[PDB]
């Protein structure tokens, strides 16, 4: 009977004519303005004000209540609280000693349901507690700044949807209009309502505690091969720029996160195996020692029913039933017939801009599925042909059509893009156009249906068409039909191609996606030289480090045998981060320059170190015998992943003053490992192949020659070269 007291208090409050007029005039909206009304100025230096205020006699304010009066005025000659009442709480003020007293001899209240209220946090601890710690590793880590989830959620919803759920749990009467959401989480609502039922914690706390484990805390962080929230929460202990810590959390890990990581592992294995002779040899070697979190890759590929080309290639390589089951987020396909050729093309979209997308050629048939609904899809290069489906759920049917329309990459689908569609992220990062178009049309479907066009429904036995509203209609969507009706032993080539028992291929290493991405769970390669599956900068730094480590021998062995120490297992790894279409050309150039340093006496140890790794890929010279000439050697990844031939670069630069070689920001001393003559010995000689310095810039020869103009000379012709700003050199063939 709290009702009576409120009505009684309202009559008390309404006797104050100043209060009356506030209640009469101030609207429910304006409550939000008068709630924040205060005298208090915002404390700009709270750190100080606290440090100071803690030296005062009564810095805290109690709430005027029977409990406040259970604190005594003094304890063993300690003034615990004063009679003076705070302006704010309108209750007695007290010393910090009051808290300490209460915590020691205070009344013992009931803490029932506390753990159920603060479950979110207890799980956070349970994960750390039931975790297992591996080894720390010292070496370069390329951290990438990505928008990640900070805290595991019970169930993810938009703040709007999430807010409406909490209302149903805590404040039923003051919920407002019943939304669809109300039904969708009826299990969660009831579950939480039953769990928080017999608690004495303040509803406002319970409200934020649920918000904490329903609303997503998603922020940019520097991560490296760990994205799963239960990893991100520990991110501080997982790695730094120059070290890494293996950590297996507790509780449970999702099959979806297990999947998306399991792909990255396989892609990373294949991307590296490609470069070696007998790729299948290495592919098997690594895959048998690849662990995803605590689970071996082989067990993971066996357990999970899904994953891309790469997963199937490795499955075959290990000897497991290859599942040709694909996923497009909500859509899940299984190929019956066809062969897809992903070619990058410039697509015009409805709003009127040009987006670069990978478009698949060939007629292909798949078993499309979406929840309870099932179907068969037939598509060709940017055209959906035919789509058969079952009549399951009205929304699961509606989604499958939209998903299948987008998946097909139909020119009609791109025409129906009217509104703001972001392919590029706020931080200028790429978002998967096909996966953004999927996400866009799932919300705004009426535009796609109208922009597609209708026709006559089928008049067959069990075939009857459906319209926009998803009802048995006369007009159906152009090539959509509804029905009443719902492997083979492969072998894998050492060069990684899946051949049928006939001879036709189904997959190859050339069919896997080139996009490297952050694994959801932590990938570990239990083989020595795990660095080989690293990033560009990691591989680059680890290679040159290995060159510097063995420089003593490697430099001597070169002055004896020519091509003996070009084939090295480190330089193989290093190849897998070179563009394959320039790998050969670079080796052609590097070897020529290296031999040119040996044979003509004009050595340069910094240059030797820089180029030696590029001398692995079988050489690719021009048609006229002479090697290709270069200013810079671009590598896989960002526009700063390149090695300059004449200058230094963000990956590699040598300071002769200090004799300090810088490799991705890490400094290494070449003191001792350097000849006496080199200091004065020019670089101009080890900059072009079959080109050596004669004198200094000769104005008669004119401006500095380009790579092309240099390549298109005849032996014994002089030329003006610029190594770096303010070092003109005169070089001859």
């Amino acid at each position: 009977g709290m009702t009576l007291a409120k009505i009684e208090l309202l009559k008390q409050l309404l006797r104050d004519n100043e209060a009356k007029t506030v209640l009469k005039q101030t609207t429910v909206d304006q409550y939000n303005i008068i709630r924040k009304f205060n005298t208090s100025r915002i404390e700009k230096n709270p750190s100080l004000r606290m440090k100071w205020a803690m030296c005062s006699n009564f810095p805290l304010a109690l709430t005027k209540g029977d409990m406040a009066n259970r604190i005594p005025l003094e304890y063993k000659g300690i003034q615990l609280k004063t009679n003076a009442e705070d302006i704010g709480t309108k209750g007695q003020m007290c010393s910090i000693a009051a808290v300490t007293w209460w915590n020691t001899y205070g009344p013992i209240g009931d803490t029932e349901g506390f753990e159920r209220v603060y479950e979110s946090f207890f799980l956070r601890k349970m994960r750390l507690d039931n975790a297992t710690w591996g080894r720390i590793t010292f070496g370069p880590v390329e951290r990438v700044r990505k928008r990640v989830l900070l805290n595991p959620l019970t169930k993810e919803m938009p703040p709007d949807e999430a807010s409406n759920v909490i209302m149903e749990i805590l404040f039923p009467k003051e919920a407002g209009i019943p939304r669809e959401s109300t039904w969708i989480h009826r299990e969660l609502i009831k579950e939480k309502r039953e769990k928080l039922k017999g608690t004495m914690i303040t509803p406002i706390v319970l409200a934020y505690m649920l918000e904490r484990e329903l609303v997503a805390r998603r922020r940019f962080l520097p991560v490296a091969g760990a994205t799963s929230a239960e990893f991100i929460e520990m991110l501080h202990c997982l790695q730094g720029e120059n070290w890494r810590q293996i950590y297996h959390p507790g509780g449970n890990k999702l099959t979806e996160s297990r999947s998306q990581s399991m792909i990255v592992a396989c892609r990373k294995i294949i991307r590296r195996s490609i470069v070696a002779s007998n790729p299948l040899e290495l592919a098997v070697e690594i895959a048998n020692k690849t662990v995803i979190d605590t689970e071996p890759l082989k067990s993971c590929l066996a357990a999970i029913d899904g994953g891309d080309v790469a997963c199937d290639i490795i499955r075959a390589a290990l000897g497991l039933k290859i599942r040709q089951r694909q996923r497009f987020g909500r859509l899940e396909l299984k190929r019956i017939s066809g062969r897809g050729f992903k070619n990058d093309e410039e697509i015009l979209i409805g709003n009127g801009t040009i987006q670069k997308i990978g478009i698949w050629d060939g007629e292909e048939e798949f078993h499309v599925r979406c929840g309870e609904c099932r179907g068969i899809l037939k598509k060709s290069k940017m055209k959906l042909e035919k789509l058969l489906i079952n009549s399951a759920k009205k929304e699961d049917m509606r989604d499958l059509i939209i998903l299948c329309m987008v998946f097909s990459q139909d020119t009609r689908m791109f025409q129906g893009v009217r509104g703001e569609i972001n392919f590029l992220n706020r931080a200028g990062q790429l978002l998967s156009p096909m996966y953004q178009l999927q996400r866009y049309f799932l919300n705004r479907s009426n535009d796609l249906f109208d922009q597609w066009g209708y026709e006559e429904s089928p008049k067959a036995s069990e075939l009857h068409g459906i319209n926009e509203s998803m009802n048995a209609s006369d007009y159906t969507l152009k090539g959509v039909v509804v029905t009443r009706n719902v492997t083979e032993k492969v072998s894998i080539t050492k060069n990684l191609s899946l051949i049928k028992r006939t001879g036709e291929v189904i997959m190859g290493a050339n069919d896997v996606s080139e996009l490297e991405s952050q694994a959801q769970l932590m990938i570990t390669y239990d083989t020595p030289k795990m660095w080989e599956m690293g990033t560009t900068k990691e591989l680059v730094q680890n290679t040159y480090q290995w060159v510097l480590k063995n420089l003593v021998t490697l430099k001597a062995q070169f002055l004896l045998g020519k091509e003996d120490m070009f084939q090295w297992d480190a330089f193989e790894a290093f190849e897998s981060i070179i563009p394959q279409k320039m790998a050969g050309q670079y080796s052609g150039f590097a070897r020529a320059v290296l031999k040119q340093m040996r044979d003509q006496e004009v050595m340069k140890t910094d240059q030797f170190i820089k180029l030696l790794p590029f001398c692995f890929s079988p050489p690719k010279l021009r048609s006229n015998g002479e090697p290709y000439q270069f200013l810079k050697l671009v590598l896989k990844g960002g526009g700063e992943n390149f090695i300059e031939v004449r200058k230094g670069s963000p990956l590699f630069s040598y300071n002769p003053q200090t004799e300090v070689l810088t490799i991705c920001g890490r400094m290494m001393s070449l003191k001792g490992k350097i000849e006496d003559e080199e200091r004065n010995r020019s670089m101009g000689n080890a900059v072009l192949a079959g080109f050596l310095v004669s004198g200094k810039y000769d104005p008669d020869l004119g401006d500095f020659k380009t790579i092309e103009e240099l390549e298109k000379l005849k032996p014994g012709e002089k030329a003006n070269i610029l190594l770096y700003q303010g070092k003109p050199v005169k070089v001859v063939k």
Partner: protein, 747 residues
């Protein structure tokens, strides 16, 4: 002997790699003393010093001395110039619109659709705002309330509709009112009967008297900006002036910024609004592309850039042009709505702060001369510096103690929109089809121009051009602070790039201190700051582990809560030591209860109360987490008259459990001496009305309640139902129900 030189580290380590050692953030930041009128007047003089060659006229609205540099004579020298050429500002924006097709209308749309949803309470989240009723700064939430209460008296109830637009309509209507009325409390004595000798007691009561002001006096107050000095301004010798704006003009600025934000978010070179890792990512990506795009044989050069007199030079009328050009496709009402904010700023008035203090050393007397009485004393009685300042102020001065200030943005009012005008300069890229190509980044005044050209002599021709291009937008590049080098290393917003943005631990060191919220919070914040630094600011595990120790000391000294087994004497320590002896599970005690610190790298992210809960004594936790403890202040669960001035419970980032250590400090009672006393009653009234409303609607604490109907109407209906259903269910009796319906009947 042997003479140590700390600069000799830079021989072994490059400056960027050890930049941290160049930031003295263990040291005290510079704070202001006394008046800011000197610093304020300087701005007012300088703003006009850069516009003096422009068109000078008298405002027939305010009567103020207006100066207009726009479309003015181009500069003859490199002294800061405000003489921006409209045509050049437009051309720059047209190129930007061509490079970013539909962006302007795309933003304008979202900015407009937002405004339609935006409520009035939006204005109650802006720190200290200038209140025109009392002509003093006040909390945003109060400054608004005083404007809504005052508007009602002038027959302006647009506020009540709840949307921002109809409230804004009332603000530009209030300028048309011949006189503006507003409440101003006066004290009144009243005899009250008491257990007293004389048999009574006199006590002063507040009484809302209706004050009036003229059309002009009000307009000037609407266009008024209050001025301070910037305290804790790091890495600067001499102080600078800052300005707070009126609740009138705050409304219209929100939309013009919200517009510019939408534009900036979808620009390649915008440093705003992106921040921290998002910004580092964007700039890291931007540098990489503009680096690799450099022509072979050519030279890529990065100009580490800063702009001088950014506020003093940037003109409102140019910002007006920008809104007009950006909203071109928007409906006529929204084109006008945006136009207001720059219009107010082009007629704005700068308040000169406290004034100047005059003293006699012989007599040992001091007196504050208020700004209105600045020219009350002969200028020989002011010091050399101030004399000149006042002489140069003379022709921009208003007798009420204010300064006309038509030119200039004022400190940081249109950051987003200035960033756009900046980017717009970077959008040109080339002039006269010369052998160079510029492209940069812009975050307010701070900019990093990249120039790819054939030789560094050509690069300079490009920079020299960019410089001259900016001069036409009123953007003056700092020749003293700006510097140029070959691309590979640069500085942008105290982020130091050297083949990748380097770690600068020193900058965020101050955040490692005891935050000063309270015990339960400061622990969480304390550990969360370390955790977050280990990630972002590259703090190694040893330094991270030390950063715990150092915190846990500062905490124990600050909250006077040393280990129970320590022999540190103190008032709290006496009971802390008794708790230590009384308690069995001592590892279960929180640090604040003289407990032992159990934090390390791995558990930084767990609440202390949750870490120790398992190994607490039941009696100890039973106290520590008492549901109705008096330190935090919960609900009644009983209904006497429990109505304190409880502010709205916020949603802070730090994760900590609500227990006895989650207390609040007593309010600064300096107010009890001054006549401002009155406001405590006004507060403790609203408090009563809200606190009760929250007892009727529990969801009000969590989510903002919506309705243009009366609070009383809402409360009445709810209680009426509550009573009926309480009766019909059987929670309430007939005798009680009769009383319920009888009492509710009286309303």
């Amino acid at each position: 002997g042997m003479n140590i030189n700390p600069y000799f580290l830079f021989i072994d380590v490059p400056i960027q790699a050890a930049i941290s050692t160049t930031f003295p953030y263990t040291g005290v930041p510079p704070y202001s003393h006394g008046t800011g009128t000197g610093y304020t007047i300087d701005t007012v003089i300088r703003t006009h010093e850069y516009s003096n060659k422009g068109k000078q006229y008298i405002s027939d609205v305010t009567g103020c001395t207006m100066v207009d540099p726009t479309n003015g004579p181009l500069p003859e020298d490199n002294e800061p110039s405000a003489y921006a050429q409209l045509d050049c500002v437009l051309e720059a924006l047209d190129r930007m619109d061509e490079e970013h097709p539909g962006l302007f209308q795309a933003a304008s749309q979202n900015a407009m659709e937002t405004l339609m949803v935006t409520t009035v309470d939006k204005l109650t989240q802006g720190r200290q705002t200038f209140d025109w009723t009392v002509c003093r700064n006040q909390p945003a939430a109060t400054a608004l309330n005083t404007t809504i209460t005052s508007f009602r008296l002038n027959d302006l109830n647009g506020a009540d509709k709840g949307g921002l637009i109809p409230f804004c309509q009332d603000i530009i209507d209030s300028l048309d009112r011949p006189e503006m009325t507003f409440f101003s409390v006066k004290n009144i004595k009243k005899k009250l009967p008491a257990k007293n000798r004389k048999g009574f007691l006199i006590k002063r009561i507040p009484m809302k008297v209706k004050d009036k002001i003229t059309k002009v006096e009000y307009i000037k107050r609407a266009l008024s900006l209050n001025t301070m000095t910037k305290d804790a301004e790091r890495g600067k010798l001499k102080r600078r002036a800052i300005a707070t704006a009126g609740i009138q003009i705050r409304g219209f600025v929100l939309v013009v910024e919200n517009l510019a934000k939408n534009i900036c978010e979808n620009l390649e070179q915008s440093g705003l609004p992106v921040g921290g890792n998002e910004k580092k990512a964007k700039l890291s990506n931007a540098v990489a592309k503009m680096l690799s795009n450099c022509p072979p044989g050519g030279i890529s050069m990065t100009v580490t850039g800063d702009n001088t007199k950014w506020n003093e030079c940037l003109n409102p009328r140019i910002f007006l042009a920008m809104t007009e050009r950006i909203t071109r496709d928007s409906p006529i009402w929204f084109r006008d709505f945006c136009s207001i904010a720059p219009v107010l700023f082009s007629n704005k008035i700068a308040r000169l702060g406290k004034g100047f203090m005059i003293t006699s050393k012989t007599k040992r007397l001091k007196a504050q001369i208020p700004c209105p009485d600045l020219f009350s004393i002969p200028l020989e009685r002011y010091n050399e510096e101030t004399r000149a300042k006042l002489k140069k102020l003379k022709p921009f001065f208003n007798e009420e103690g204010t300064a006309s200030l038509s030119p200039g943005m004022m400190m940081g009012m249109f950051n987003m929109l200035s960033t756009v005008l900046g980017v717009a300069a970077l959008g040109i890229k080339n002039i006269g089809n010369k052998e160079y190509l510029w492209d940069g980044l812009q975050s307010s005044d701070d900019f990093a121009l990249f120039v790819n050209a054939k030789d560094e002599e050509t690069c300079m021709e490009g920079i020299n051009d960019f410089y001259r291009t900016c001069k036409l937008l009123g953007i003056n590049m700092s020749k003293k602070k700006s510097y140029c080098n070959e691309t590979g290393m640069f500085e942008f917003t105290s982020m130091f790039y050297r083949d990748g943005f380097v770690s600068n631990f020193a900058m965020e060191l101050p955040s490692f201190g005891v935050a000063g919220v309270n015990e339960s919070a400061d622990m969480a914040i304390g550990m969360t700051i370390i955790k977050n630094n280990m990630i972002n600011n590259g703090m190694g595990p040893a330094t991270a582990q030390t950063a715990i120790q150092l915190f846990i000391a500062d905490y124990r000294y600050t909250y006077k809560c040393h280990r129970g087994d320590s022999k540190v004497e103190g008032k709290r320590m006496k009971i802390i030591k008794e708790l230590w002896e009384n308690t069995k599970g001592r590892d279960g005690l929180l640090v604040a209860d003289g407990g032992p610190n159990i934090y390390n790298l791995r558990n930084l992210h767990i609440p202390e109360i949750v870490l120790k809960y398992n190994l607490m004594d039941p009696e100890y936790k039973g106290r520590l987490l008492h549901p109705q403890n008096p330190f935090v202040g919960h609900l009644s669960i009983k209904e006497a008259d429990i109505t304190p001035a409880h502010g709205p419970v916020k949603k802070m980032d730090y994760d900590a459990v609500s227990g006895t250590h989650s207390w609040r400090t007593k309010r600064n009672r300096s107010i009890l001496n001054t006549d401002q006393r009155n406001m405590i009653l006004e507060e403790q009234c609203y408090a009563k009305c809200c606190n009760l409303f929250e007892a009727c609607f529990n969801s009000a604490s969590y989510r903002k309640p919506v309705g243009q109907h009366s609070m009383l109407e809402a409360m009445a209906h709810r209680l009426r139902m509550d009573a009926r259903l309480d009766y019909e269910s059987g929670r309430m009796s007939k005798d009680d129900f009769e009383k319920a319906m009888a009492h509710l009947g009286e309303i």
